[PDB]
Write a protein that binds this ligand. Structure first.
Ligand SMILES: [Cl-]
Ligand SMILES: [Cl-]
Ligand SMILES: [Gd]
Length: 258
């Protein structure tokens, strides 16, 4: 037929065409989160939107390197250096540093999260922007591991509303990757979510990440339709647009027929 039939039962992921000035990178908003609170971040509502009802600490924009790798200090015989989690041992030392005199259970202050001075031991952050597929097809997003709790959402009315990136979070819990810290135990590594995307449309993207204590980890990747993998540095794929709530045509509910 003259036209494609469209994804079945309106199943295409909603995307956007913002007409404003495109900016490289994602916006990162930071919110208060309590040290050693292992329960708040176990709730879907909290991870989708509830985080923004706590105190906003600040923000940084234009971030293209979006992976989290936060290692606590080891106060060692030779000075204070960050300890890779896999190198921590005993009660406690860090391999190649000897015994550490400092507690694993207190808050620590650092700029390791996107240059923003905060407590990476205990914080919640929201990354927002738009993913621009250069290729039409299936994209598979993944978290290699999660310390401590995280979601990733893709699409208009899932991540956020088109042309409304800067607005209070929407209530959708239809996560693309659910890496929420379980109540009982934890969850596997390399948790994944797949989205079919049309080249040249802007797909809203939200990552919400939380840490309660010590090490923070969120290695973010995407597998492209060509089978190659982009890890950590999403330069060329992620962008921000200032809100334009007046741009009437901004939402594309079905890019499969637009
Ligand atoms: Cl350090
Ligand atoms: Cl050692
Ligand atoms: Gd942690």
């Amino acid at each position: 037929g003259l036209v494609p039939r469209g994804s079945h039962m309106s199943g295409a992921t909603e995307a956007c065409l913002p007409a404003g000035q495109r900016k490289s990178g994602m916006n990162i908003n930071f919110y208060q989160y309590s040290l050693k609170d292992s329960s708040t971040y176990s709730n879907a509502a909290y991870m989708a939107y509830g985080y923004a009802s706590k105190t906003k600490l600040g923000s940084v924009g234009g971030q293209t390197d979006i992976s989290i790798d936060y290692n606590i200090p080891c106060v060692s015989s030779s000075g204070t250096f960050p300890c890779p989690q896999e190198d921590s041992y005993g009660n406690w030392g860090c391999k190649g540093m000897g015994a550490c005199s400092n507690s694993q259970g207190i808050a620590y202050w650092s700029t390791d999260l996107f240059g923003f001075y905060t407590t990476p031991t205990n914080v919640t952050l929201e990354m927002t922007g738009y993913f621009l597929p250069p290729q039409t097809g299936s994209y598979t997003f993944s978290f290699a591991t999660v310390d401590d709790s995280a979601i990733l959402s893709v699409g208009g009315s899932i991540a956020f509303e088109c042309c409304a990136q800067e607005q209070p979070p929407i209530t959708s819990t239809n996560f693309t990757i659910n890496g929420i810290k379980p109540w009982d135990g934890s969850l596997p590594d390399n948790i994944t979510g797949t989205v079919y995307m049309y080249a040249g449309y802007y797909y809203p993207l939200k990552v919400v990440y939380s840490n309660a204590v010590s090490w923070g980890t969120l290695p973010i990747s995407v597998e492209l339709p060509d089978g190659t993998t982009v890890s950590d540095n999403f330069e060329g794929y992620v962008y921000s647009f200032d809100d334009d709530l007046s741009q009437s045509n901004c939402t594309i509910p079905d890019p499969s027929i637009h």
